[PDB]
Amino acid sequence: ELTQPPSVSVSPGQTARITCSGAPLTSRFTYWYRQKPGQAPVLIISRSSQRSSGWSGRFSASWSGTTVTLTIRGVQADDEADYYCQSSDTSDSYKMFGGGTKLT
Amino acid sequence: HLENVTEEFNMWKNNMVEQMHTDIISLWDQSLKPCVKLTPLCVTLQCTNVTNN
Ligand SMILES: *[C@@H]1O[C@H](CO)[C@@H](O[C@@H]2O[C@H](CO)[C@@H](O[C@@H]3O[C@H](CO[C@H]4O[C@H](CO)[C@@H](O)[C@H](O[C@H]5O[C@H](CO[C@H]6O[C@H](CO)[C@@H](O)[C@H](O)[C@@H]6O)[C@@H](O)[C@H](O)[C@@H]5O)[C@@H]4O)[C@@H](O)[C@H](O[C@H]4O[C@H](CO)[C@@H](O)[C@H](O)[C@@H]4O)[C@@H]3O)[C@H](O)[C@H]2NC(C)=O)[C@H](O)[C@H]1NC(C)=O
Numbered sequence A: 001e002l003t004q005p006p007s008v009s010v011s012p013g014q015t016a017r018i019t020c021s022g023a024p025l026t027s028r029f030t031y032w033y034r035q036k037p038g039q040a041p042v043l044i045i046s047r048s049s050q051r052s053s054g055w056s057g058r059f060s061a062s063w064s065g066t067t068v069t070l071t072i073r074g075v076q077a078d079d080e081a082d083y084y085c086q087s088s089d090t091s092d093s094y095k096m097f098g099g100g101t102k103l104t
Numbered sequence B: 001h002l003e004n005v006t007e008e009f010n011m012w013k014n015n016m017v018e019q020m021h022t023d024i025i026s027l028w029d030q031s032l033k034p035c036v037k038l039t040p041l042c043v044t045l046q047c048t049n050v051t052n053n
């Protein structure tokens, strides 16, 4: 029963803030992805080591107790679509889905 | 090689393993007595789990 907001907005050329709240946030990590209308989603951020995965300049991520923080680049121009959020249960069985925010 | 002889051995009553057991013990301590003692290592340790993201 994870919780991702579905309606937030921000000005272009400014830092934004994407969250996703859920109790099974330990052995799950975080997905997001941005599906432009009628297209296929791509890697929002990808794990290439067990330590961290915010190496690319465009995006970074932070971790809180339950809510997850998807910080983004300074310029928010040209790239806009709804950002979902996905994770896995503690038994490493199941993948929860719970919406995601469309940003304008 | 001994011929025509049939001496009765014993393994679980053999004393060669007993002197071996006790030799290695006194040898272990003899190689550790002249080394760094770690007595001021018993102090209140404040630890936290390692970085697992
Ligand atoms: C002593 O020996 C006896 C011998 O009979 C043991 O009894 C059986 O022995 C076999 C020997 O291989 C065991 O191994 C295999 O069992 C699987 C089914 O296991 C499934 O359930 C177990 C728990 O019982 C679980 O641990 C397994 O986990 C596997 O799959 C998960 C799935 O994760 C995936 O999805 C999740 C989402 O849900 C994702 O998050 C995740 O990323 C991933 O995508 C993996 O995570 C695990 O890593 C692991 O791979 C399973 O869920 C059978 O399918 C095996 O054999 C069958 O297929 C082979 C291949 O085709 C075929 O050759 C064979 O004939 C079978 O058809 C195999 O049986 C048994 O578990 C074991 N137990 C049973 C049922 O009796 C006994 O356990 C031994 N004792 C000890 C202490 O070791």
Ligand SMILES: *[C@@H]1O[C@H](CO)[C@@H](O)[C@H](O)[C@H]1NC(C)=O
Residues within 6 Å of the ligand: B049
């Ligand atoms: C660290 O590991 C210990 C092992 O018992 C556990 O009790 C404790 O809750 C863990 N702390 C965190 C925050 O991982």
